[PDB]
Amino acid sequence: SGINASVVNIQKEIDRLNEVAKNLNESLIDLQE
Amino acid sequence: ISGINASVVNIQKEIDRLNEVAKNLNESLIDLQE
Amino acid sequence: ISGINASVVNIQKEIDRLNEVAKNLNESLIDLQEL
Amino acid sequence: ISGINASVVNIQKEIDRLNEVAKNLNESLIDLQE
């Protein structure tokens, strides 16, 4: 129903959040050394 | 100073991605309610 | 309905947290640009 | 350079916040599937 469209979209956004964290970690590595 | 430049660009792109996440979660709320 | 509301409130709370993260990252960005 | 060190600390704090958000959204996903 609407709930499972919601679950698909929330899972996609969780994946996007993981990507954001990874990219911020690489920017930290560039800022340090 | 080039690494600081690259950090500024990358952090801005990630801010844009966070805004995208927030907006998609908002219409996920619309799909959950009705 | 009750549980739907519980999911809705929790996701809204996480949206507010994400907006806060965006604001703080923008402030660190402004500090990086003036340096 | 102290501003760079402070930027590193603060961005790490926000990365931790983002991971916590991901965990809470996974918990809401588990509740939505039931």
User: Angle at Cα A12 formed by Cα C19 and Cα C28, nearest 5°?
Assistant: 30
Query: What is the Cα–Cα distance from A21 to D4, expressed in whole angstroms?
Result: 19
Query: What is the Cα–Cα distance from A11 to A33, expressed in whole angstroms?
Result: 34
SS3 D33: coil
Count of B-D CB contacts under 8 Å = 3
Q: Of the candidates C8, C14, C29, which has its C-beta nearest B8's C-beta? A: C29
Declared resolution, Å: 2.5
Contact B18, C22 (CB under 8 A): yes
Query: What is the Cα–Cα distance from A14 to B14, expressed in whole angstroms?
Result: 14
Taking the CA of residue B3 and the nearest CA in chain D, the distance in Å comes to: 11
By what technique were these coordinates determined? X-ray
Query: What is the Cα–Cα distance from A12 to D7, expressed in whole angstroms?
Result: 29
How far does CA D17 lie from the centroid of its chain?
Answer: 2
